[PDB]
Structure formats: C-alpha cells, structure tokens
Enzyme design. Structure first.
Site, PDB file in Angstrom:
ATOM      1  CG  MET A  12      44.640  36.351  55.175  1.00 55.97           C
ATOM      2  SD  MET A  12      42.877  36.730  55.015  1.00 55.97           S
ATOM      3  CE  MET A  12      42.963  38.517  54.799  1.00 55.97           C
ATOM      4  CG  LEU A  28      41.307  36.306  60.267  1.00 53.09           C
ATOM      5  CD1 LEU A  28      41.307  35.632  58.901  1.00 53.09           C
ATOM      6  CD2 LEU A  28      39.890  36.318  60.850  1.00 53.09           C
ATOM      7  CG  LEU A  34      40.576  41.320  59.806  1.00 52.81           C
ATOM      8  CD1 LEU A  34      40.800  41.787  58.370  1.00 52.81           C
ATOM      9  CD2 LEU A  34      40.749  39.819  59.932  1.00 52.81           C
ATOM     10  CE1 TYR A  59      41.712  26.394  52.443  1.00 52.62           C
ATOM     11  CE2 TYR A  59      40.485  26.650  54.488  1.00 52.62           C
ATOM     12  CZ  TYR A  59      41.216  27.200  53.455  1.00 52.62           C
ATOM     13  OH  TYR A  59      41.441  28.560  53.437  1.00 52.62           O
ATOM     14  CB  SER A  66      45.262  27.230  51.193  1.00 58.25           C
ATOM     15  OG  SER A  66      45.681  28.293  50.371  1.00 58.25           O
ATOM     16  NE  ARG A 100      48.667  41.278  59.741  1.00 60.64           N
ATOM     17  CZ  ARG A 100      48.837  41.013  61.034  1.00 60.64           C
ATOM     18  NH1 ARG A 100      49.397  39.872  61.410  1.00 60.64           N
ATOM     19  NH2 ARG A 100      48.450  41.891  61.952  1.00 60.64           N
ATOM     20  CE1 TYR A 101      45.704  38.123  60.453  1.00 57.53           C
ATOM     21  CE2 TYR A 101      44.452  37.632  58.471  1.00 57.53           C
ATOM     22  CZ  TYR A 101      44.824  38.516  59.452  1.00 57.53           C
ATOM     23  OH  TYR A 101      44.325  39.802  59.454  1.00 57.53           O
ATOM     24  CB  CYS A 132      42.216  49.614  55.417  1.00 56.11           C
ATOM     25  SG  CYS A 132      42.146  51.083  54.330  1.00 56.11           S
ATOM     26  CG  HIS A 199      36.518  38.788  50.106  1.00 59.13           C
ATOM     27  ND1 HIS A 199      35.630  39.393  50.978  1.00 59.13           N
ATOM     28  CD2 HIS A 199      36.943  37.660  50.734  1.00 59.13           C
ATOM     29  CE1 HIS A 199      35.523  38.662  52.076  1.00 59.13           C
ATOM     30  NE2 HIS A 199      36.298  37.603  51.950  1.00 59.13           N
ATOM     31  CG  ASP A 276      42.895  28.464  41.830  1.00 60.67           C
ATOM     32  OD1 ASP A 276      41.873  29.165  41.640  1.00 60.67           O
ATOM     33  OD2 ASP A 276      43.399  27.718  40.958  1.00 60.67           O
ATOM     34  CD  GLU A 279      38.485  33.302  49.959  1.00 62.65           C
ATOM     35  OE1 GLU A 279      38.304  33.588  51.164  1.00 62.65           O
ATOM     36  OE2 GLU A 279      39.531  32.731  49.564  1.00 62.65           O
ATOM     37  CD  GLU A 283      32.316  32.649  48.162  1.00 62.84           C
ATOM     38  OE1 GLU A 283      33.495  32.947  48.506  1.00 62.84           O
ATOM     39  OE2 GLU A 283      31.348  33.433  48.270  1.00 62.84           O
ATOM     40  CB  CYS A 339      40.079  55.649  55.381  1.00 66.94           C
ATOM     41  SG  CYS A 339      40.459  54.133  54.450  1.00 66.94           S
ATOM     42  CB  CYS A 342      41.485  56.221  59.099  1.00 65.86           C
ATOM     43  SG  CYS A 342      42.640  55.182  60.022  1.00 65.86           S
ATOM     44  CB  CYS A 347      46.102  53.855  59.438  1.00 73.20           C
ATOM     45  SG  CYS A 347      45.033  52.426  59.567  1.00 73.20           S
TER      46      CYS A 347
END
Ligand SMILES: C[C@H](CCC(=O)O)[C@H]1CC[C@H]2[C@@H]3[C@H](O)C[C@@H]4C[C@H](O)CC[C@]4(C)[C@H]3C[C@H](O)[C@]12C
Ligand SMILES: C[C@H](CCC(=O)O)[C@H]1CC[C@H]2[C@@H]3[C@H](O)C[C@@H]4C[C@H](O)CC[C@]4(C)[C@H]3C[C@H](O)[C@]12C
Ligand SMILES: C[C@H](CCC(=O)O)[C@H]1CC[C@H]2[C@@H]3[C@H](O)C[C@@H]4C[C@H](O)CC[C@]4(C)[C@H]3C[C@H](O)[C@]12C
Ligand SMILES: C[C@H](CCC(=O)O)[C@H]1CC[C@H]2[C@@H]3[C@H](O)C[C@@H]4C[C@H](O)CC[C@]4(C)[C@H]3C[C@H](O)[C@]12C
Ligand SMILES: C[C@H](CCC(=O)O)[C@H]1CC[C@H]2[C@@H]3[C@H](O)C[C@@H]4C[C@H](O)CC[C@]4(C)[C@H]3C[C@H](O)[C@]12C
Ligand SMILES: C[C@H](CCC(=O)O)[C@H]1CC[C@H]2[C@@H]3[C@H](O)C[C@@H]4C[C@H](O)CC[C@]4(C)[C@H]3C[C@H](O)[C@]12C
Ligand SMILES: C[C@H](CCC(=O)O)[C@H]1CC[C@H]2[C@@H]3[C@H](O)C[C@@H]4C[C@H](O)CC[C@]4(C)[C@H]3C[C@H](O)[C@]12C
Ligand SMILES: C[C@H](CCC(=O)O)[C@H]1CC[C@H]2[C@@H]3[C@H](O)C[C@@H]4C[C@H](O)CC[C@]4(C)[C@H]3C[C@H](O)[C@]12C
Ligand SMILES: O=C(O)c1ccccc1O
Ligand code: FES
Ligand code: FES
Lengths: 359, 359
Positions: A12, A28, A34, A59, A66, A100-101, A132, A199, A276, A279, A283, A339, A342, A347
């Site tokens: 991600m 995102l 998503l 952050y 990150s 992804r983002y 997914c 998660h 790392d 999260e 968190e 799924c 789904c 997919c």
C-alpha cells in the site's frame, strides 16, 4: 546487461513526509476496489483534507514519515543480489516498487518495467496473507492499467499473490520473537503472553469471504509450532476505526483485559506485515505500549522487531521468487477462486488476466 | 485386570432418540457456562419445551436420532485396544463417555471412573479445536463436579484440551477429501471448490477472545498443505441462529454465492467434527445439499464422509493419549491462558484445577 526478469513488489505504501499525507489519503479514498462511497469523486478530496492534520500528527509522533520505502528498497536489493546468483537462467533481475497510494505508484512501476524491455514480470505482493482490500486492490490495479491504456502487455506476467506459511518467513518471525523474549526479565519469561496482532477488517468484508483472517491464522500456528508452544498466545486485531462492526477482539481491549486479569507481561507481534510503519511505530509502540499499558499497570510489554532488514527475510523473498519461476506457476490455486460473495466485477477479470497469461 | 488409566471422552452429545430431545435442550439451556438467560431456571424448561417439536422433526428427518454415541463408542474401543499395546505401563486402559447434555453425563462418567479406582484420568476433549463454549464448558463441568461434591479427586487428572493439527487427524481429513473428489465426475474434479464448514460463533464470543476460529483455520491450512493445494478453498461457518451477529460468511450464503458466480461444483468438509451430527446429516446434507443447492442450480455438491469409523482415526486418538502420557503434560500451554476478555470466574478455577494436579 539488460534486465531480463522484473519483480514488482506491491504494498500500500505510506507518506514519506508529512507533506505527502494528503495525496496518500486522496488516492486511497478514490480507490473503488477498497471502498465505495456516495459521490466519491467529491467526498474523497474532502475526507482526505479532513483527516490530513490528524494523520500528519501521527507521523510527526514517529519521526515525521513512513519507513516503508527504505525497508522495501533494502529488502528488494537483497532479493535481487541473491536471485542473480541462484537463478542465472533468469538473470539479470530487477526489483520495482509499486505502492498503491504513494509514489512510486503501481502504474508508474509498470510503465518503467515495460520500457526496460523485460521478458518476465512477477507481481510479488508484500502482504503474506491475502486480503481483497490489499493484495486484491494491487493486483486489480495491474489489470486496470493495461485495460486503461488499451494495450496488451509486452512482458509475460504472473503473480506470487500470497505466502502466509513460507518456512523462511516463519523462521524470521520465530527468530524475532525469541530475541524479544530474551529481552524480558528472565524471571518473567515463561509468564509472557504472546499477542499476535494483525490489522482488523470490518465484518462486512470478513462476511463476504475474505481469505485474510484464515491465512493470518495459518501464519500464527506455523510460528507457534516452530516455537514449540513455549508461551501461550492469542491472535487479536488492531486498527479498527469508525462505528461499524469489525473483527475482534481488538488489540487494545485485549491488552487491557489481560492486565485486569493478572497477565501483565505481554509480547506484541505484528504478524501481518514485514516492516515497520504507523501501525507498529505509533499504534502499538506509542498508543498501546507507552500509554495504554502504563495506565493498566503492566509489568513488561515489548514488541517483536519488524522483519525490516533481516538478511534471512531477503532470502525468503529470493526463495519465493526462485520457486515461483521454477514451478512455472501463474498464481496460487487460491487466486482461481473469488470470494463466494464477491460483488466487484473486476476481481474476476483480474483473476483471468493472470490465469490466462501466455507462458 | 482392574483398569489403571481412564480416558474420558468429552463431547456435547446429542439425543439418542426423539424422546431424548427435551432433556437435551433443557440441560443445555441451564448451562450458565454456555449462556446467560433472564429467569433462567424458568425460561430454560420453557424454551426447551418450545423448541422440542422442531428439533424432534429435524432428528426424524435423519432417521430418528443422533449417532454420536455409536461413533464415540467405536472410536473409544479402537483407541483402548491400541493403547494397551502402545503403553503397557499405563494399561489396562478404559474409555468413558462424558456427554455434556445427554446420558451418560460428564458427572456420571466421573462417578464411574472414581468407583473404578483408576490411578490416572485424562479429560480428552473430542473437539480438536478449542472453543470456550464446548471444550471449556466440559472442562468446567469436571471442576464443578468435584467442587459441588465437596471431595478432592482420588485419581490423577490431566487434559488433552485441543489438538487441531495432529498429523493423523489431518491425514484422515485429507484422505476423506480425496476419496470424495474421486466421486465427482472426472471432468469436474479440477473445478471443484472446497468449502470447509465449521460451526459458527456469535460475534460476542469471538470478540472476547475465543481461540476457536484461529485453531479451525490451522486445521484447514494443514489439510490443504497435505493435499498440495489441489483445489481452491474457503473456510465458512454454519449453524447461526437468531438475529444477533455471528461469524461469517455463512455456509448457506456461500453455497448460493458460489453458484450465482458460476462455481457449481462444491465439496463440503465438516472440519470441526470427527463424527456425524445433526449439523452434517441434516443441515449440510439435507438443507444445503438437497434443497438449497438444487434451487441454486448446482451441478455437483458432495460432502466428505465424517471420520466416524476410520481405523486411522482410532490410531490418532491412541497416539494423542500415548504422547500425552509420555510427556507428563497436564494440559496444553494454551490452557494456561484464559480469554483476554473472559467474564466467567470459573474458567480460571478450572484452569488451575488442571495445572495444579499432582503428577
Ligand atoms: C480496513 C481497510 C481495508 C478494508 C476495506 O477494503 O474495506 C483499511 C486499509 C487501509 C486503511 C486506511 C489507511 O491505513 C489510512 C488511514 C489510517 C488511519 O489511521 C485510519 C483511517 C485510514 C483511512 C485507514 C482506514 C482503514 O483501516 C483502511 C481503509
Ligand atoms: C454512508 C457512507 C457509506 C456508504 C457506502 O460505503 O457506500 C458514509 C461513509 C463515509 C461517510 C462520510 C465521511 O465519514 C465524512 C463525513 C463525516 C460527517 O460526520 C458526516 C458526513 C460525511 C460526509 C460522512 C457521510 C456518510 O456517513 C458517509 C459518506
Ligand atoms: C474514519 C474515516 C473518515 C471519517 C471522518 O473522520 O470523516 C471513514 C471514512 C470512510 C470509512 C470507511 C469506508 O466507509 C469503507 C468501510 C465501510 C465499512 O462498513 C466499515 C469500514 C470502512 C473501511 C470505513 C471505516 C471508516 O468509517 C472510514 C475510513
Ligand atoms: C494462588 C492464587 C490464589 C488462589 C486462592 O486464592 O485460592 C491465584 C489467584 C490468581 C492467580 C494468578 C492469576 O490467575 C494470573 C496468573 C495466571 C497464570 O496462569 C499463572 C500465574 C498467575 C499469576 C496466577 C497464579 C495463581 O494461581 C494466582 C495468584
Ligand atoms: C433477552 C434474551 C437474551 C439475552 C440473554 O442472553 O440473557 C432472549 C434469549 C431468549 C429469548 C426468549 C426466547 O426466545 C423464548 C421467547 C420467544 C418470544 O418470541 C419472546 C419471549 C421469549 C421468552 C424470549 C425473550 C427474550 O427475547 C429472550 C429471553
Ligand atoms: C453457538 C453456541 C455456543 C456459543 C455460546 O452460546 O456462547 C451453540 C452450542 C450448542 C448450540 C445449540 C445446540 O446445538 C442445540 C440447538 C440446535 C438447534 O439446531 C439450534 C439451537 C440450539 C440451542 C443450538 C444453538 C447454538 O448454536 C448453540 C448454543
Ligand atoms: C433460537 C433459540 C430459541 C429461540 C426461540 O425458540 O424462542 C435462542 C434461545 C437462546 C438463544 C441464545 C442465547 O441467547 C445465548 C447466545 C446469545 C448471543 O447473543 C447470540 C447467540 C446465542 C447462542 C443465542 C442464540 C439463539 O437466539 C438462542 C439459542
Ligand atoms: C470466457 C468467459 C467470458 C469471456 C468474456 O466475455 O470475456 C468467462 C466468463 C465466466 C467464466 C467462468 C466463470 O467465471 C466460472 C468459472 C471460474 C473458474 O475460475 C474458471 C472456469 C469458469 C467456468 C469460468 C470460465 C471462463 O473464464 C468464463 C466462462
Ligand atoms: O480468528 C478469527 O476471528 C477468524 C475469523 C474468520 C476466519 C478465520 C479466523 O481466524
Ligand atoms: S472481494 Fe474477494 S475476490 Fe472480489
Ligand atoms: S471465556 Fe474463554 S477462558 Fe473464559
């Protein structure tokens, strides 16, 4: 020499600096794989703007960004060095990062792989357990890239779409766990309770058949078997947000519950990622270990170090790619089943994109 | 020769005949470890009477009763025969059936073990994956018996409280799956989707930290590893009742969902049971496989045969007990940790009951 085999490492991603938070969130909230939102093109920018200060502050609390790209790069470099020596028939290898983002985006990486004139391309998810929402969305983005540009690929594609029980992944986790156990006072070591924390997912996703929690559970059992059940454990779930039902128990509630029940020596293990990020660094380390656990009267709480730069993890990655190449697999057998509930038409098309590849 | 070692086989039980249904339901609705009801001493007999006809009807549709006692007896005989040869130093071995809600009751079995003057007593749950509502309640029943009778045991107790990945259990499941796959039309074999189906839990129980779903998932992964991922699969959950949220996806919704999405060849696997029960003979075989599946236009749906009389399963049981004896274990490491959000004071006492036993 020209690169022959490209390994696209999918994750991600996360904002490298506080300045990157807004576009991170925006991309995102625009991802319909998503989540679907009413008037999405209008709500996405607004929610991104709304959450940006709060997320920037998180952050800031971990050092200002990150570390995902740094760890991903080091892991990729190590993987390539190994692959060039143990798979000369497919050398030279090159790794590409497809976040992804955030930059570099999946689409940007595919563009660069094409220009590099690769013979073979492997979509290598960096999530060992398939969801997914994560791996699915990343794979969907690949199919969509080619669909959107109206051209066929010039490279032979395939995917390593999950790897929840790869024996070297298992060894790395068990290794990091034993190391952290050595850091508890000796007199408390046997009393340590292990909380595997992954998660969470909202129940609407679990209930449509997402394979994630079963695969996470497999990773946990494999790690514990390798540790010979030296300590008792529970798999618990973190990062729930909002008012809807998610899969529990929550990691925060479990820490508190354990302490109220006299179990005050706790080892947290981030079992669903390999480096790392917010999260773990915010968190788990700050919210739960520094703040919550202090309030609950904990005796000792520690968290196993993320896999990060462990050379054995680079070996895991190289071995995965090596076996994938030698077996000629296009994807896992599991990818051939969507799924049971789904509701996303892409997919099936994405699944077909991989299973139908020319060998 | 006088029996030296008793193996108490714990299971919920089921009504042997239609006449047994009411008292089965009554005992169940009275079990505060299983559930809390308002005016429970009054509501319990009423709900029992209220559900009795409906449940009698279900048992009638499968032939008039539960076969659990027959299968438990056969398995126990096989286990004991083997144990006398495997471990003569603990022989003669004798099995006792301790059903939670029907005769012979857990309490009746304990009384008989006590009269038989055993040296050694093993609480051997017949649920391979631990749930506080099943195995938990059975272990609680043992502690409560001694507490209510006001006498300490005259036997040395221990428990085999879970065994979700025992290699011979896994082999039995894999064997029965392969045998069932052989019964599909050859042209459909590769297309078969495997639905592992386990009894669901209400989310209120999952969210307090019940170890069950993680252990069931471990069993699933072990079976699929052994099968070399020959077909795609999902773990799904059956038997939800009432309006509250339970863990899904539901087995029934999943079957329908697969069919609507073109996967019309399905193999059901009862992965959390070792013999036939109403959940297999009525719910899976009649409600889902005969009625629902036909309505959905399934091509082929089959269910893997329950372990029942497989002699390899008897070997699994004997091996488990034998290993338990050799290791001098009182219980799994996992039993030493109660749910992080356990609200039952008895759980801790029962845990201590086993961990504190004289060796
Ligand atoms: C649960 C969900 C994926 C499941 C789904 O597809 O519905 C995950 C994946 C990425 C997550 C989001 C990203 O981590 C970015 C945000 C992080 C914040 O700390 C919470 C909201 C936040 C926006 C997250 C909400 C939620 O946990 C997300 C969306
Ligand atoms: C109803 C909808 C979810 C429906 C769906 O997922 O398709 C939810 C998800 C995100 C929600 C929005 C976001 O939480 C952002 C806004 C939050 C405000 O408190 C309410 C309006 C607000 C704009 C919300 C409206 C509504 O509750 C939304 C749009
Ligand atoms: C917390 C965040 C923003 C709310 C706000 O502060 O305005 C909202 C906006 C979109 C929401 C998500 C989306 O509606 C998609 C998911 C919908 C599921 O029913 C719950 C989780 C789910 C992942 C939601 C979690 C959370 O409520 C989100 C991430
Ligand atoms: C022996 C003592 C009191 C029993 C009694 O009053 O009869 C009990 C009560 C609470 C128990 C403790 C708590 O349950 C918390 C821990 C649980 C672990 O499984 C053993 C150590 C552990 C620290 C327990 C040791 C011991 O059994 C305690 C201390
Ligand atoms: C509120 C309670 C569940 C809460 C709890 O577990 O204590 C539920 C469980 C079983 C329910 C009862 C049983 O369903 C039997 C009756 C069914 C009728 O439709 C309502 C009254 C009736 C007597 C129910 C009242 C109430 O809804 C009960 C008692
Ligand atoms: C899910 C629950 C155990 C979890 C718990 O309540 O905490 C299980 C264990 C035994 C189950 C019950 C028994 O199987 C007997 C009944 C069987 C009927 O088909 C449904 C109601 C019925 C009364 C079941 C309801 C529910 O599924 C129970 C109570
Ligand atoms: C369906 C059955 C009887 C309903 C009726 O005939 O009135 C009711 C009575 C008691 C109920 C159970 C008890 O309330 C205990 C559990 C409470 C959880 O919140 C849901 C599952 C749970 C296991 C309930 C499932 C189901 O609604 C039960 C078993
Ligand atoms: C090729 C064809 C549609 C072609 C298209 O319009 O592009 C697709 C649409 C539905 C597909 C089928 C359905 O998705 C159901 C099955 C899914 C399995 O993973 C493959 C066989 C399977 C039977 C599929 C074969 C093939 O890919 C089908 C028949
Ligand atoms: O652990 C869970 O809560 C769970 C839920 C669904 C599937 C597998 C699982 O382990
Ligand atoms: S949502 Fe899981 S395959 Fe589409
Ligand atoms: S409810 Fe799980 S130990 Fe008490």
């Amino acid at each position: 020499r020209k690169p022959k085999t490209g390994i696209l490492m999918l994750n991600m991603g996360g904002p490298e600096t506080l300045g990157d938070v807004h576009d991170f969130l925006l991309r995102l909230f625009l991802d319909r794989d998503l989540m679907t939102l009413p008037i999405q093109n209008k709500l996405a920018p607004f929610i991104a703007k709304r959450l940006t200060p709060k997320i920037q502050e998180q952050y800031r609390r971990i050092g200002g960004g990150s570390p995902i790209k740094i760890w991903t790069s080091k892991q990729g470099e190590g993987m390539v060095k190994l692959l060039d020596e143990l798979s000369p028939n497919t050398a030279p290898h090159k790794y590409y990062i497809g976040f992804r983002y955030v930059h570099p985006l999946t689409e940007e990486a595919i563009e660069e792989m094409e220009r590099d004139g690769l013979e073979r391309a492997i979509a290598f998810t960096q999530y060992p357990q398939y969801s997914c929402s994560t791996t699915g969305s990343s794979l969907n983005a690949i199919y969509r890239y080619y669909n959107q540009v109206g051209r066929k690929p010039t490279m032979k594609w395939s995917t390593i779409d999950r790897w929840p029980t790869h024996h070297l992944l298992i060894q790395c986790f068990a290794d990091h766990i034993l190391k952290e156990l050595d850091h508890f006072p000796l007199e408390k070591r046997s009393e340590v309770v292990i909380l595997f924390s992954a998660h969470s997912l909202p129940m609407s996703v679990v209930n449509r058949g997402d394979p994630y929690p079963q695969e996470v559970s497999a990773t946990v059992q494999k790690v514990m078997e390798r540790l010979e059940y030296c300590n008792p454990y529970r798999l618990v779930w973190q990062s729930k947000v909002g008012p809807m039902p998610w899969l529990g128990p929550q990691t925060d509630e479990s820490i508190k519950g354990l302490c109220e029940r006299g179990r005050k020596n706790i080892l947290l293990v981030p079992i669903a990622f390999t480096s790392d990020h917010i999260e773990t660094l915010y968190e788990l380390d700050i919210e739960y270990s520094q703040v919550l656990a202090k309030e609950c009267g904990v005796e000792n709480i520690r968290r196993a170090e993320s896999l990060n730069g462990n050379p054995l993890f680079s070996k895991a990655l190289a071995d995965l790619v090596h076996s994938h190449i030698q077996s000629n697999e296009l994807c896992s057998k599991q990818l051939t089943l969507s799924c049971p509930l789904c509701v996303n038409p892409v997919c099936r098309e994405t699944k077909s994109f991989f299973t139908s590849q020319q060998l």
